[PDB]
Amino acid sequence: LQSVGQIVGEVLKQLTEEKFIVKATNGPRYVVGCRRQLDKSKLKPGTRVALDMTTLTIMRYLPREVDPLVYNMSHEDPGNVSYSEIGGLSEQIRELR
Amino acid sequence: AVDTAEQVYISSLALLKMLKHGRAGVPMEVMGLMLGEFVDDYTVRVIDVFAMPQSGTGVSVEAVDPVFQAKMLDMLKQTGRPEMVVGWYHSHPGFGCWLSGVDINTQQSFEALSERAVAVVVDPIQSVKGKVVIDAFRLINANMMVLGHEPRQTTSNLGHLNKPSIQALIHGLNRHYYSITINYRKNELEQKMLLNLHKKSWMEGLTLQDYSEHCKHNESVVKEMLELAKNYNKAVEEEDKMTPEQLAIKNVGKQDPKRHLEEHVDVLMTSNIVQCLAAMLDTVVFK
Amino acid sequence: EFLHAQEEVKRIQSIPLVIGQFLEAVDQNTAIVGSTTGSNYYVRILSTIDRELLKPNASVALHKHSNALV
Amino acid sequence: HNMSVKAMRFPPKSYNKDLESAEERREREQQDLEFAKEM
Amino acid sequence: MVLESTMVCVDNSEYMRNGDFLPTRLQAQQDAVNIVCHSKTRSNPENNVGLITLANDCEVLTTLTPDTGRILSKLHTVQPKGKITFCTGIRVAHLALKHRQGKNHKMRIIAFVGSPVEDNEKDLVKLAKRLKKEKVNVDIINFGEEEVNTEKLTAFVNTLNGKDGTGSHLVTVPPGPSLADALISSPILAG
Amino acid sequence: LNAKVRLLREELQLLQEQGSYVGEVVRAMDKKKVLVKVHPEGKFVVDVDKN
Amino acid sequence: AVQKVVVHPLVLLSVVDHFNRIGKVGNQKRVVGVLLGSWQKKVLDVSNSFAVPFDEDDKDDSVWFLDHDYLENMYGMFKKVNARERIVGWYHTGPKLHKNDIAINELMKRYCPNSVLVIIDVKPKDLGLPTEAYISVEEVHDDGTPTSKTFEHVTSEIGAEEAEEVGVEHLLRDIKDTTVGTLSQRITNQVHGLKGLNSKLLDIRSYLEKVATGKLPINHQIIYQLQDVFNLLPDVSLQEFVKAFYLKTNDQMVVVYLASLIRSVVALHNLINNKIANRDAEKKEG
């Protein structure tokens, strides 16, 4: 109970060595700094970053998002129907396969 | 009781150490402890500071860790440095100067160990080429205020030279703690040593540059000079055909040759004169 | 002294930054600009910046709290 | 050029007017700051 | 009740390595150092011990520390080689006694001899009186191929402590091949 | 020169004040009252300064 | 191996106050400490340093004492606060290099195979840099020894970081350059160069005076370099050189001529503008 969350945004480009410009999930865009120990070679435009909620500094980069809808759509099939239960259209099945 | 004329004296090394340490860990609040002495009860001198290991995944560290502090204190003595601790310091990046809620409890321990400690707060990213932001505070108790009395009895007018910022007033400040004045002690030896920065060797002032890029640069400059010369008279002619109330706003989107040519003239004259003079004396310095 | 004084005004540029679009300049050192938050403002211009670069649809950076052109 | 700059400031005269921002706006600013601090 | 800081000065020359004793004189040094350091540890718990070697040019193995195992491990890997440079070894030992954390402690230096020494009379008397000037006491253990009548050593006794005080002592060579540590067990407390 | 320097310092000081909105007025009223409408909010009836 | 070394003011201030606090106790002549820094390509950077107990006797240059455990535990202790730093070399504040330097360098080459020696002068009196950088190497010649240990110099300079820059700028309130232009481009470059060249020639004069009268350890590499120096002086009496020089100078002066003309025109325009704008102000008062 001694930790706080961080806002999530997307980087657009860097002005100089210590200044980037990033866009949150919502509208507003900010000119922000970055952490000293963090690597600067991975911050290509389009990546997703996490910013502090009181100073808005680059802290960490993250992989691409996966929507919960797409996750649900990815795997939902408890059925186990095989080719023996379907008959009468042995040519269209070959055409599809 | 305590007075408003209390003074604190900070050396140069301590300032630079704490500034560098605070700037290194910008996104969080790093902390350390100072050391010095109390020559009297009006002025407190601090002579050296040292950082301390922190626990990550946060922005605050408890100061209770006796092993490291004891080891550093008993090891510094072996090479001089018989001084004792006088207080602690921590940095607020881009906020200002105040004491957060936990900070009162944090400084309560030092107050209990020694009733005349002090807390120093440095702002590492709000200072540029001077005007470093450093403040010093001490706590007060509310029971004495219940008695209808106020601390820091005033005996002179040198304690109220700086008006506090509005953000310090917004937080606790005078109803929870009081700030004290600050000063930097300077001597001639370190100041004379420190001014050697950016000084260049005697070789850099006798080289006379290549005689091939110089003519290219002059040729480049002359053409833009010509174009600005052509564009000057157009703006000269229409200087009064329009009312002067909107004259200033007329030059808000497009450049003006009058301001944009003087810099060309200046750089060109300087380069040519210095390049001539260098060769002039070099022709006779060597043989 | 003036050379030293001209440099102390850069204290208002470190972290507080919001990106906005320049809209109009009513007169000298005062303008109206529209932030990306979604509202317009009538604000004051910093003196030392070069007025020549203020083109109709340029993008500028503003103070977070005072919301002044920086 | 030097001669020209030597004949520069002769016509200006009686420019004692020196006003920075205002006269009584400081009181209003201080009152607003105190009101914000109190709240 | 004395707080004492001890410096051990161990020889590893090519004459010391001679093996007239039942084991090599190396093991005599090891077990003698063991018993003396143990005696000094039970003498006072917060005492500390440092170690230096005698060679062509002397060199220190461990700065004054209250630990014991590091000293034993460091001396266990020594290899017998070199000559004796007693004077410079004593000088650098005295240097090591300074810059010591125990400013209130009492100085003590113990030295080993197992090789002939080319000492100079005027040099040794000057060194002895200088070391007296800074209130330094030295105990010396001679064994193996002893110096002729320890006569040079005798000069130290004439010059160093031994007159108007018992702050210094000398142990003669034990000729017998038997364990010399048991024989020297008494003088270390009766010195 | 002195006036320029002092003006620069005061200009540094006076840049930490709030901005002012822009709005469209629909119609006025009596005893110094007007009705205005600023787009990211509703309609406000306000007064007028003395100048 | 090493091309340039960069020194921050922090280590300079640390050297100064270490020297002060250890020399106040007694009359010591030389003090020793160990540096911390970083590498990148062939450029070395020095960040901070800490002291170490050291003793040396003036009676002989073959007796001295350092502390191993102190250095080890202090490095381990600084490791827990910043892991980027590492041991790079050592410094001694002696006015000139001593005989024991080779022995100490060999002693602490264990912790860094590429140790770099740095000499800092604590009371400089000239405009030259206070720091000098050396690196060990093995040299070979005809007879005497197959190899011998010898120091070689490496270029050094004083750098600055942003926080260090603002700190030193706040500390240097009293002294600041008057103007930036031909002034700083001339005095800071040319006169100082003449000063340094004269000082170097005076030093080599002194060494040459020491020979053929006094000690006389005739060394041959110095003689070879002196012959090379005295053979490389150009001749300025040649006709073609004079013609080329005159051609280039005549080519260069026209640009200054043109710039002066433009400045005069701009000044006249400013005078006209001011006079016209100001003559229309007296009648407004009535």
Side-chain angles (χ1 to χ4, degrees), chain G residues 79-95:
Chain G
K79 278 296 294 301
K80 278 148 74 208
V81 64
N82 188 0
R84 214 61 51 100
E85 308 292 335
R86 205 167 311 285
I87 292 170
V88 177
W90 56 297
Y91 76 90
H92 86 85
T93 63

mmCIF file of all heavy atoms in Angstrom, chain G residues 79-95:
data_model
loop_
_atom_site.group_PDB
_atom_site.id
_atom_site.type_symbol
_atom_site.label_atom_id
_atom_site.label_comp_id
_atom_site.label_asym_id
_atom_site.label_seq_id
_atom_site.Cartn_x
_atom_site.Cartn_y
_atom_site.Cartn_z
ATOM 1 N N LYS G 79 30.142 1.506 -4.096
ATOM 2 C CA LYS G 79 29.419 0.688 -5.067
ATOM 3 C C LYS G 79 27.922 0.658 -4.773
ATOM 4 O O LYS G 79 27.102 0.623 -5.697
ATOM 5 C CB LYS G 79 29.989 -0.728 -5.083
ATOM 6 C CG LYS G 79 31.234 -0.878 -5.931
ATOM 7 C CD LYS G 79 30.930 -0.609 -7.391
ATOM 8 C CE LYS G 79 30.007 -1.677 -7.952
ATOM 9 N NZ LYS G 79 30.606 -3.034 -7.825
ATOM 10 N N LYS G 80 27.547 0.673 -3.494
ATOM 11 C CA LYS G 80 26.148 0.519 -3.112
ATOM 12 C C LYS G 80 25.305 1.757 -3.386
ATOM 13 O O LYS G 80 24.078 1.679 -3.275
ATOM 14 C CB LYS G 80 26.045 0.148 -1.632
ATOM 15 C CG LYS G 80 26.243 -1.330 -1.357
ATOM 16 C CD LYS G 80 26.885 -1.556 -0.001
ATOM 17 C CE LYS G 80 25.897 -1.306 1.126
ATOM 18 N NZ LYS G 80 26.581 -0.858 2.369
ATOM 19 N N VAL G 81 25.916 2.888 -3.735
ATOM 20 C CA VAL G 81 25.168 4.101 -4.013
ATOM 21 C C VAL G 81 25.130 4.430 -5.504
ATOM 22 O O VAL G 81 24.148 5.019 -5.970
ATOM 23 C CB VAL G 81 25.723 5.292 -3.201
ATOM 24 C CG1 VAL G 81 27.145 5.622 -3.622
ATOM 25 C CG2 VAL G 81 24.818 6.509 -3.334
ATOM 26 N N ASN G 82 26.153 4.054 -6.267
ATOM 27 C CA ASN G 82 26.168 4.273 -7.709
ATOM 28 C C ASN G 82 27.064 3.219 -8.336
ATOM 29 O O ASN G 82 28.267 3.189 -8.063
ATOM 30 C CB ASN G 82 26.662 5.679 -8.056
ATOM 31 C CG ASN G 82 26.500 6.007 -9.527
ATOM 32 O OD1 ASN G 82 26.015 5.189 -10.309
ATOM 33 N ND2 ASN G 82 26.907 7.209 -9.913
ATOM 34 N N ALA G 83 26.481 2.359 -9.166
ATOM 35 C CA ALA G 83 27.213 1.249 -9.760
ATOM 36 C C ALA G 83 27.867 1.601 -11.089
ATOM 37 O O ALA G 83 28.635 0.788 -11.615
ATOM 38 C CB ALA G 83 26.284 0.047 -9.955
ATOM 39 N N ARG G 84 27.588 2.781 -11.645
ATOM 40 C CA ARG G 84 28.174 3.143 -12.930
ATOM 41 C C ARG G 84 29.653 3.488 -12.805
ATOM 42 O O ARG G 84 30.421 3.263 -13.745
ATOM 43 C CB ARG G 84 27.408 4.315 -13.541
ATOM 44 C CG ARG G 84 27.325 4.279 -15.057
ATOM 45 C CD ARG G 84 26.594 3.037 -15.535
ATOM 46 N NE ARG G 84 25.310 2.867 -14.866
ATOM 47 C CZ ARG G 84 24.139 3.193 -15.396
ATOM 48 N NH1 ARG G 84 24.050 3.709 -16.611
ATOM 49 N NH2 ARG G 84 23.029 2.991 -14.692
ATOM 50 N N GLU G 85 30.068 4.034 -11.664
ATOM 51 C CA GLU G 85 31.451 4.443 -11.473
ATOM 52 C C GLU G 85 32.359 3.229 -11.281
ATOM 53 O O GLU G 85 31.922 2.144 -10.890
ATOM 54 C CB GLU G 85 31.569 5.377 -10.269
ATOM 55 C CG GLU G 85 30.616 6.563 -10.296
ATOM 56 C CD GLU G 85 30.946 7.562 -11.389
ATOM 57 O OE1 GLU G 85 32.119 7.617 -11.813
ATOM 58 O OE2 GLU G 85 30.034 8.301 -11.816
ATOM 59 N N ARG G 86 33.646 3.428 -11.564
ATOM 60 C CA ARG G 86 34.632 2.366 -11.416
ATOM 61 C C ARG G 86 36.008 2.993 -11.240
ATOM 62 O O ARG G 86 36.238 4.146 -11.615
ATOM 63 C CB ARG G 86 34.614 1.417 -12.619
ATOM 64 C CG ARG G 86 35.127 0.018 -12.321
ATOM 65 C CD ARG G 86 34.798 -0.948 -13.450
ATOM 66 N NE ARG G 86 33.401 -0.863 -13.858
ATOM 67 C CZ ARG G 86 32.384 -1.358 -13.166
ATOM 68 N NH1 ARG G 86 32.568 -1.986 -12.017
ATOM 69 N NH2 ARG G 86 31.149 -1.218 -13.640
ATOM 70 N N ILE G 87 36.926 2.214 -10.663
ATOM 71 C CA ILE G 87 38.285 2.690 -10.435
ATOM 72 C C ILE G 87 38.995 2.853 -11.770
ATOM 73 O O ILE G 87 38.930 1.971 -12.636
ATOM 74 C CB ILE G 87 39.048 1.726 -9.516
ATOM 75 C CG1 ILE G 87 38.462 1.756 -8.109
ATOM 76 C CG2 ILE G 87 40.528 2.072 -9.483
ATOM 77 C CD1 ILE G 87 38.997 0.671 -7.221
ATOM 78 N N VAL G 88 39.665 3.991 -11.949
ATOM 79 C CA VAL G 88 40.315 4.299 -13.217
ATOM 80 C C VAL G 88 41.793 4.609 -13.006
ATOM 81 O O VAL G 88 42.623 4.348 -13.883
ATOM 82 C CB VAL G 88 39.601 5.471 -13.915
ATOM 83 C CG1 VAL G 88 40.311 5.840 -15.186
ATOM 84 C CG2 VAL G 88 38.156 5.114 -14.208
ATOM 85 N N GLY G 89 42.140 5.140 -11.839
ATOM 86 C CA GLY G 89 43.515 5.530 -11.590
ATOM 87 C C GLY G 89 43.630 6.265 -10.270
ATOM 88 O O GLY G 89 42.746 6.172 -9.420
ATOM 89 N N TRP G 90 44.724 7.010 -10.120
ATOM 90 C CA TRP G 90 45.000 7.711 -8.876
ATOM 91 C C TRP G 90 45.569 9.090 -9.170
ATOM 92 O O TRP G 90 45.943 9.410 -10.300
ATOM 93 C CB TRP G 90 45.964 6.918 -7.983
ATOM 94 C CG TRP G 90 47.268 6.559 -8.630
ATOM 95 C CD1 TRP G 90 47.449 5.759 -9.720
ATOM 96 C CD2 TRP G 90 48.574 6.954 -8.201
ATOM 97 N NE1 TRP G 90 48.786 5.649 -10.009
ATOM 98 C CE2 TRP G 90 49.498 6.373 -9.090
ATOM 99 C CE3 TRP G 90 49.052 7.749 -7.158
ATOM 100 C CZ2 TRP G 90 50.871 6.562 -8.965
ATOM 101 C CZ3 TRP G 90 50.414 7.937 -7.038
ATOM 102 C CH2 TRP G 90 51.307 7.347 -7.937
ATOM 103 N N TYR G 91 45.623 9.910 -8.124
ATOM 104 C CA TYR G 91 46.148 11.262 -8.208
ATOM 105 C C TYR G 91 47.044 11.538 -7.011
ATOM 106 O O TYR G 91 46.816 11.025 -5.911
ATOM 107 C CB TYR G 91 45.026 12.310 -8.270
ATOM 108 C CG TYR G 91 44.342 12.584 -6.946
ATOM 109 C CD1 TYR G 91 44.813 13.568 -6.086
ATOM 110 C CD2 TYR G 91 43.219 11.869 -6.566
ATOM 111 C CE1 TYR G 91 44.193 13.817 -4.880
ATOM 112 C CE2 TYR G 91 42.587 12.117 -5.365
ATOM 113 C CZ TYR G 91 43.078 13.090 -4.527
ATOM 114 O OH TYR G 91 42.451 13.335 -3.329
ATOM 115 N N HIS G 92 48.067 12.359 -7.242
ATOM 116 C CA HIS G 92 48.925 12.871 -6.185
ATOM 117 C C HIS G 92 49.203 14.341 -6.462
ATOM 118 O O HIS G 92 49.419 14.732 -7.612
ATOM 119 C CB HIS G 92 50.230 12.069 -6.074
ATOM 120 C CG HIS G 92 51.313 12.528 -7.001
ATOM 121 N ND1 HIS G 92 52.166 13.565 -6.692
ATOM 122 C CD2 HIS G 92 51.694 12.079 -8.221
ATOM 123 C CE1 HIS G 92 53.020 13.741 -7.684
ATOM 124 N NE2 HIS G 92 52.756 12.853 -8.625
ATOM 125 N N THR G 93 49.190 15.153 -5.405
ATOM 126 C CA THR G 93 49.232 16.604 -5.529
ATOM 127 C C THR G 93 50.649 17.160 -5.552
ATOM 128 O O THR G 93 50.835 18.358 -5.313
ATOM 129 C CB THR G 93 48.448 17.255 -4.389
ATOM 130 O OG1 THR G 93 49.064 16.927 -3.139
ATOM 131 C CG2 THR G 93 47.020 16.753 -4.380
ATOM 132 N N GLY G 94 51.645 16.326 -5.827
ATOM 133 C CA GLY G 94 53.012 16.778 -5.883
ATOM 134 C C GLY G 94 53.233 17.778 -6.996
ATOM 135 O O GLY G 94 52.677 17.655 -8.091
ATOM 136 N N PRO G 95 54.050 18.798 -6.733
ATOM 137 C CA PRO G 95 54.343 19.783 -7.786
ATOM 138 C C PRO G 95 55.020 19.172 -8.995
ATOM 139 O O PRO G 95 54.849 19.672 -10.113
ATOM 140 C CB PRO G 95 55.250 20.795 -7.074
ATOM 141 C CG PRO G 95 55.856 20.030 -5.946
ATOM 142 C CD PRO G 95 54.802 19.065 -5.497
#
